[PDB]
Each structure stands twice: as C-alpha cells, then as structure tokens.
C-alpha cells in the first residue's frame, strides 16, 4: 500500500486527492507517454 | 503496384459492378472473395497465403462523389523490420502507386471493353 | 481485407464479454444462494 | 482486478471533477496497454532530477525527497520523480488539474467543518515484526530464528561497548596509536573515549583534549573506518537473524570471512605494534590500503538494512552496485564475488524451483510459491484459481538479473508446478546452476533450455496421461451425437421424462433411463463414459441465456434477475448434461468453461426434438395419402405448414450441420494438431467452442429471441397439430381449441414468423454481412415461391 | 467507411463489454469480501 510514502511523495512534490490510483497505475507500469496524455486529458477534464 | 495482370483484370472486372454499385453497397466480404479467387485463378496462386496477409484494404475517405474506380484501392501491410522500412509514408507511397494504378487498370479493362 | 478485420475483434470481445456476464451472474446468484 | 480501471481511472474521471473531455476513461485504456509486469525505465534519471530540480520553486525538499525516497528503495520511484517533473512543465495542465482538486478540496473542506535512534530498540522491533512476518508467511510451521538467547548476552558479539597531559609527542602518537588500535579491536582508547552507537553508527569518538590537533585531524580518518567497522558488525548481526533470512545469514557469513581479513590486518599491523616499529604516518598509508574498503563493505550492508531488503530487494541492490562499484574494481569484483555465492541461497531454490521443478519456499525467496489452490474443484467451479492459482508470482521478490526471465521464468516454474501437480514431480534435467555471473543474457539462456525442456514435458504428459484425444472423440458423441446410436437413445428415452414437468421428472427413473440408454447402443467404444452424466438447470437455457445477451441490455431485472421461480419446473427446458475430469485429469471444464461446452448439447437436442416432432407428425400423417388432402382443411394446412416450416427449422439445422459445425470442429482438431502447451491446447479449444457458438449464433439477445420465437412456434405447431389430431382420432377441448382448421391461421402465424426470422437473417447479412448470415440468406431464398415474396417483404421496409 | 463503421461498433460495444465485465469483477470481489 504505502499510503504514507505516497503522501511522503506528495510532500515531497510540495504542491498547493491522494492521487494514488495514479500510483495504482504505476503497480500496474503504465507507460509514461501515455501517463502524460492522461494527465494533459485529466487536466482539461 | 498492379502486378500479376491477370489478378489486376480480375479486380478491376470484379469491381466495376461494384464501382457501379453504390458505396455504401459494397460488399466487403464480396472484396475478399474476389481477392482469393483471382489469387487461385491466377497464376498469383503461386503467391502465398503471406503474400495474402500482406493483401490488405482500407476506406480511402468519405467521398461517395467520384466514380467506382476511382475510389477503389487495395492496401499492403508491413510488418516488423518490413514495418521500419515500408514506413508509413512509404506506405502511402505504396498505396499511392496501387490508387493511380487502379485508376489506369480500371479504366484500362473499361477502354479495352471500349 | 485488413479493414473489415475489426468486426472480427468486435465479435470476440462482445462473446467474451457475454461468457463473462453469465458466469459472473452464476457466481453472484451463487453468492447469494 | 483486469478491470482495475474501474476502480482507479473511471473514478478518475468521476473524482477528479472531469466528467467532460474523455476523463480518465480513455486514460485508463492508454495506461491499460501500457502496463507491464516487469519495469522498462532506462532513462536520464539525472537528467529528469535535474530538471525537476530546475522547476523546484522549494528545491530544497524536492531534493531531499529526492534523496529520501531511495532510502527505503521503493518500487519505482523514477517514474513519480518523472511524472512530478514532466506535470510541472505545463502550467495549463497543472492550472486545469488544480481546477478538477481545489474544487473538490473546498467541498471537502466545508463538508468537514459542519458536522531518539536507539540500536537496540530499532532492531527489537524489526526482530519481533520479522518474526510475526515470517509466521504469517509460515502459516502453521515453525521457524529456525534466531534463539532468544541469541538476542539476550548483550554485546554476544564481544561489541565495543590513560594520562597524556604532557606525553611527548612521539607516545602520544604511541597512545593514540593504541588507543585506535582498542578501538579497531572495538575496545576503549587509552586518553580519550569513544560514546556507543547513537542507534545506527559505530562509535562516536570523543577525542581526548590532550589528542594534537594535528593528532585528533590524522585520527579523524580513522574514526570513519572505525564507526563502518563497528556498525559492520552490527549490520552482520542483523543479517544473522533468521527473521534477516537465511540468504542474508549467508551474506553475513561471506561478510565475517572478509571480516577475518579485518582482524587480519589489525594482527598485520600489531606485529609492527608488538615490535614497537609502526608509525602514524605508517599506519595511515596501511590503512589507506583498506580504510575504505571498510565503509565499501559496509555500504552494502546499510544498503540492505534501510532497504529492509528481504527477498529480491537486497538482491537488487547488490546486482546494481555490483554494475556501479567500477572505479573502485576491488568492490565491482567483490561484490560480484559475493552476487555469485549468495544467488546460490536462492538460486538453489531457484534451481529448485526450476530445475527441481518444485520451489522450496521456508523463505519463499523465489517469486514462484506454491499458492494454495485446490486444482479438484477446477472443474466443478465456474471460478476456478488452481489452473492458475497453484503457484501465485511474488511480482515483488524478484532478483536484479532474475526479473529479466521472471515472466518467462513465470511460465516455466508454472510449468514445472503443473509437473509437479501431475503427481509426477521432476527436476528438469537442464539444472544449470543458479548462481550469479555477470552474463545477463546467460541467465536466460539455459533458462530458455529449461522452459523448453519444461513445455515439452508438459506437452508430453498431457498426449499421456491426460490423453484428451479419447476425451474428445468420446465427447463427439456427447452434445453433438457424431453418431445416430449416440443420442438415438437419449431422444427415444427422455421422452417420458420431459413429459413428466421439471417438477414432475423422476430422478431416480431418469439415471435408470440413463443407465438403459448407456447400454442401449453398440457405440460404446469411448472409455469416457464414466467421466460423463445427465443433468438439468433450474431455468430453461434461454432463462439465462437470454438474460446474458440482455445483459442489463433491456431485462436486467425484468428477465434475468426475474428468478425462474416465477414461472414454473418445466422438463425440456430444465435438463442439463454433466461431465467432469479430474484436477490433474483435465479439470479444464470449470462450470463457466463446462456450462460453455454443455450447452451445446441443450440447444442441439432441442433442434433435434422440435425435428423428431415434426417426423412424429409426418409419420402419422401417412394416411393422407390415400385420399385427396383437399378434404383435411383441419388437416390439410398442416402439409404447407409444415412445407414452409421445414424451411425454418429443418433448412435451419443444416447450417448448422454443416457450414457452423465444420468449421469449428475442424479448427479445433487442426489447432490441437498444432497445440504444443495448455495455452495452445487452450486455444485450440477455445476456437472450437466461440467459434461453434457464433456459428450456432446464440448471442444475439434480439436475433436469438427471434429464432427462439420461431422455434417455439414450431413446437406450438406441432402441439397444435398433436392435439387436433389427438381430438380427431379420438373424434373417429383444449387440444381441439388449440385448432380447428385455424392450424391454417397457426401456419399462416408461423409464415409471418418466418418471414420475421428471415428479416433478421437478413438483417444479420446487412449489417455484418459476414459468410454465416449470406448462407441463412442464401438458405431462405432457396426459390422465389417462397423467396420473392419474401424479397418482396424485405422491400417491406 | 464500412470498415470504419465495424471499428466504431467494436470500440463501443468492448468498451461496454469491459465496463460490464469490470462491473462484475468489482462485485464480485465486493461479494467475495
């Protein structure tokens, strides 16, 4: 799970929503190509 | 690149009712089925069952306008290292030279019907 | 002969996808009887 | 799960307040082929940190975590650094991503308010975890862990647990030459003194005031070794705990024989001691020979512990820096050195598993472990896990070099415990050492021989003592007669039963009927017979197959979850089949892939009943002959009835018989031909039964009602035409009701019937074309007599 | 554009099936727990 090192990550990142189905995603190696795409699609909604 | 002449009649004869018949009508199945039987009529049979998987089709676009023969075309896949070297544009190239081949061997069984 | 391949695909997902449907309700029915 | 995508992406879209746009939808399937088992992220990480650092409007916890997070060696954390980087470069992706959260976090927000490092102590908990760990993972057996008296005699290790206010110089460089050498032997120093390991450390020095400056800056370089050293020892104890691993216990044993060189040299130079003959300056250049091999060694060994490596993790680790200890070629080699001996702690596992095809798993260090699943109920299940359940894949316990093959290493050591499995466990000839070399592609290599080899012997074993060919030639005659005699008997006996109601059959005179019947024939050459039986369903095969093909299409609750309670135990519709093959004996048939290859046999034998009615009628209707029809108008319909009906159900089956049976039957035989593994068998299989049933067409919830409407208005039909012919040959109420000569209105219903089911035929060769639908097309429009009017209705549009 | 038209029907009718079959999953292993 890493619930806590993903929210360590999240910190880490020090931004302003988990975003851990992202990490799911990552479990599963998703490509960063399309992780891009997704996150540019997920973006403009 | 309209080779074997006598699979190029065959399509071009097989497709002129189709060109004749409406777009929305033809029969794709109908298209394959020309494709084998000129392949075992002809001396294309000799081609392999490969060379029939390398034997690919495509709609060209949305352009019920032009004539039957104008619009038909067949396609040629690569595959693998046949993928990075037919590329895509040189698979438009390809299928480039088999459109303006169709257009002439349509045409061509059309003018010696003429 | 490459562009009506598509259906064939279509055909196999929709088959799989109904199989899955009937074995699923089987096991759900199971799991609730 | 494989739909996974529901869970994360779909709420993706929904949660992420993207409900516009494609969401994380069409996200989720880019990202589902994009998703490996194994990891591919060769890049410039140095690079992307850079990069990430150059966006980085707080850089300094950018790079801490940049740091941090490879203190625990979490998996794959250059893809989030990577993905932090890249999301930062557009603003208006990352303004657009704030949009679809700070929303949402306001929501929340207002929805809310409405309503010190001791040594001892960090390795006592990680001792306990590690022993409730390896319990759990034990699941009722014991453990060779380390003694609690191994825990207690504290510093069981013998661990590191003199007035110089105006020595010459000379003996201070003397005493604190004694002092080091105390303290490199772990004891105390002569002048000054050395406070304990502050948790993970050696010994933290407190220089003696009267130590030169000069003298405290020259042992400066000493204390570094001297704090490896002793946390060296440490971190050897840590991997002696079993809880460590016997694979660590095996590191820090290859540790303690380098260890040996340690206090080797310490003798070296206290020969020099003794003799009163060294020098500072002349240790330092000794030390200097190994000094930093010290902290190299232990550099390896915090590398496992903050790693927590257990399993492939330390493996990893060790892979990696054996590929990055160049530069100081002492540590590439002996790193390497220590890579080859401890791959053998697992790779004799490995081997095991591989070669011995069973995986020894006290540790279960290799990713292959035998999960428990019940490879008996397979068959009878619908769900069914020991076909793939047998040995689970520890994806996350994986070796640095052994990941590479892990997936093909997955399907070998599959294969081996499917050896394994079929009782006749076996090593795998090719037992190539597991060990570890610096050959990566030579890992594989003999890897591939053993997958072969194992594949191989799979496919032998299934051609014996599997012997699916009589399975099959046997199950010809099952659901698909292959033979009149097959289910001549069948059909000739379960008459009297489907007579009697579903709740009105007999089961007892059933398995009687059906032991008759098994003895009934001479085809009785398949030996399979045993592993084959009748059954019956509560709900006809359209009770669920309908509410399949509606899948929440249109009777999510109104038919399919509408119980057949609600209607009542009809025989026909009810019967079933069984069969089943043992667990190492073909449990292939789960109830989900059984019910598959049953029902086949149901809508067959249905065809086959409505046909043997339709004999029946005609048989009795032999007198007719011996007059003029023109005088039967309650009899005389029945003959074009059944002429234009033929054409519905007889001219139905035989597209069936031939055109759908061929080639499904045919491609079964040819790709088995072909099958070389399960998963080619399983293919070869699979074709002959989707294949069969698309042929057989029975997944169009609308066509199929409408084929089943026809079918049941032949069968209203015939019971129409039984029953007047039941109230006119006792006639030399409700059967006479059923007709009246109206059988010619029946047959007229029965027409229109037909020329619906030809428009769906029709409808079939229209929009699917296909071969299939032209022939039932082709099949209908057998002449115009009956054909151009039905071109002529088809116009009827 | 026939080919077109059987890739569409596929891309919409998998994407249903998976939807469904996802479905299923999801309460199946809700159903198993």
Known sequence: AEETELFELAQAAGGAEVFKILVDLLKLNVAPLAVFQMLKSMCAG | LLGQGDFI?????????????????????????????????????????????????????????????????????????????????????????????????????????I | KDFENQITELKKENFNLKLRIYFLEERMQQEFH | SEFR????????????RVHGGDGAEVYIDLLQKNRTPYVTTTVSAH???????????????????????????????????????KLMEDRETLQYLQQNAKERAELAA?????????????????????????????????????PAWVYERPALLGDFLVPIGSLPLASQEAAVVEDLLYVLVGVDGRYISAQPLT??????????????????????RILPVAASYSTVTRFIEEKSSFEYGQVNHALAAAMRTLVKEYLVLVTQLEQLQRQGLLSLQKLWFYIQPAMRSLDILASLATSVDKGECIGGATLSLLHDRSFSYTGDSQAQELCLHLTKAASTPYFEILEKWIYRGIIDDPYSEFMVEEHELRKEKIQEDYNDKYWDQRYTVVQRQIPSFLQKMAGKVLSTGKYLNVVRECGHDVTCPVAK?????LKERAYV???????????????????????????????????????????????????????KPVDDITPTRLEALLELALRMSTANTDPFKDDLKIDLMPHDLITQLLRVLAIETQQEKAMVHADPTELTLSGLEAFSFDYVVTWPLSLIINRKALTRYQMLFRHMFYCKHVERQLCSVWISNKAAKRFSLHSAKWFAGAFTLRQRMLNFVQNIQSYMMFEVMEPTWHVLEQNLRSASNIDDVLGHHASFLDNCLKDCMLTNPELLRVFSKLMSVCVMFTNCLQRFTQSMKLDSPQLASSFEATITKFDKNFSAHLLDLLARLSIYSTSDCEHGMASVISRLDFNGFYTERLERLSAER
């Open chain 4, 5 to 16: 995508i529901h869970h994360d992406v779909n709420e993706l879209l929904s949660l992420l």
């Open chain 4, 199 to 220: 948790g993970r450390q050696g010994r933290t020095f407190l220089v003696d005031p009267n130590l030169d400056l000069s003298i405290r800056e020259l042992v400066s």
């Open chain 2, 9 to 113: 009649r065959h399509l071009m004869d097989l497709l002129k009712p189709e060109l004749v018949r409406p777009a929305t009508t033809l029969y794709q199945h109908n298209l394959t089925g020309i494709l084998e039987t000129a392949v075992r009529a002809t001396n294309a049979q000799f081609d392999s069952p490969e060379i029939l998987k390398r034997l690919d089709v495509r709609l060209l676009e949305v352009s019920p306008g032009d004539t039957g023969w104008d619009v038909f075309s067949l396609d040629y896949h690569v595959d693998g290292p046949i993928a990075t070297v037919f590329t895509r544009e040189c698979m438009s190239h390809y299928l480039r030279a088999f459109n303006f081949l169709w257009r002439a061997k349509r045409v061509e069984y059309i003018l010696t019907d």
């Open chain 4, 110 to 146: 207002s929805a809310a308010a409405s309503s010190g490092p001791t040594w001892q102590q960090s390795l006592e908990l990680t001792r306990k975890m590690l022993r409730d760990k390896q319990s759990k993972k034990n699941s009722g057996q014991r453990l060779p862990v380390l």
């Open chain 4, 433 to 437: 050492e597991v060990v570890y070399t």
């Open chain 4, 445 to 499: 290599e003999q890897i591939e021989k053993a997958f072969s080899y194992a594949s191989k012997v799979l496919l032998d074993f299934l051609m014996g003592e599997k012997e699916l060919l009589a399975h099959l030639r046997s199950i010809k005659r099952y659901f698909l007669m292959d033979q009149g005699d097959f289910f001549v008997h069948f059909m000739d006996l379960t008459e009297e039963e489907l007579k």
């Open chain 4, 47 to 85: 690079s992307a940190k850079v990069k990430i650092a150059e966006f980085s409007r707080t850089p300094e916890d950018f790079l801490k975590k940049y740091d941090e997070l490879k203190s625990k060696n979490t998996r794959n954390l250059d893809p989030l650094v990577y993905l932090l980087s």
